[PDB]
Structure 1
């Protein structure tokens, strides 16, 4: 049982997304910038509607990103001037141009949940495939969810933790966690 991971270096974010786009289809992105943490959704093709401008670094731009869908997750972090390391995590063996494949054996993987911030807002956003949670603590949170949220729905980010031996003594740990999807409970 292997967790496959694919790594590329000195690559810009928008190139990293494009180089992965056949796998990141419909992925939720979480982009990290000095001023904003924003969710995005890639097209079912995997593109983003302002991709270059959205993923540009040089003007308070994206220094870290995570893209996740059912099959895989892309991670990117800026090393210098908007060029940085991409790692894609997938439980499936897959081919990528330029990415060096690796793998980790893991003993088992276990489901985990994270409750998202907020209750369903009294109306969803005007954008299709978006919903609004809100909590007085943070205000609105627009999430790329296509289910119309019922009152007293709660949204959970589901993840899978991979457990492996860290020591030659046999000590186990969770070696990584892959984010999967938003789910309504």
Structure 2
């Protein structure tokens, strides 16, 4: 089994997402900025409703971003003045322009979960007295006893030539209600 990962360097976040848009369809995304950690959803075409002004770096702009859906995850992090490295992670071999392909073999993928902050207060709201509110891109409404989880897959592979396994990556998949 192969984990395919695609690198492009010296690329802005706005351009990195636009390069991946065919794959980041409907993808949830998390944007790290000096003052906010905002959750965003790309539309079915993989576009953001204010992508330039949201993804720019110039003024307390996004320095790191993640976007994920079922099939793939895009990661980006700033390296100089708003240019960065993009890495897209995919289960399947796919065509991208400018990106360089690579892969790593993995022994098995194991699912994980991550409970989000808050109880239920398209878009839904969780809230917790500890943090106040958290808004999540989630289309179905939430019953008062629901909790929203985030799912991921960890890929185990041999690191050492002595055969020692480790989880070489963890790709995010989707938000899920449990």
Question: TM-score when scaled to structure 1?
Answer: 0.96
Measured after TM superposition, the shift of residue 143 of structure 1 is 0.1
**How many equivalent residue pairs?**
178
Give me the whole-angstrom Cα distance separating, in 1, the residues matched to 2:159 and 2:51: 39
Residue among 123, 137, 145 paired with 1:152: 145
Give me the whole-angstrom Cα distance separating, in 1, the residues matched to 2:40 and 2:92: 24
Measured after TM superposition, the shift of residue 55 of structure 1 is 0.1
Question: TM-score when scaled to structure 2?
Answer: 1.00
Q: State the superposition RMSD in angstroms.
A: 0.3
Q: Deviations over 1:116-157 (max 9, x none)?
A: 000000xxxxxxx00000000000000000010111100000
What does 1:88-167 correspond to in 2, within 5 Å? Answer: 88-121=88-121, 129-167=122-160
Measured after TM superposition, the shift of residue 89 of structure 1 is 0.2
Q: Deviations over 1:86-111 (max 9, x none)?
A: 00000111010000000000000100
Show structure 1 runs of 4+ deviating over 4 A: none
What does 1:1-185 correspond to in 2, within 5 Å? Answer: 1-121=1-121, 129-185=122-178
Give me the whole-angstrom Cα distance separating, in 2, the residues matched to 1:173 and 1:134: 35
SS in 2 for 1:40: strand
Query: Mind listing any 5+ residue stretches in structure 1 that lack a counterpart?
Result: 122-128
Measured after TM superposition, the shift of residue 42 of structure 1 is 0.2
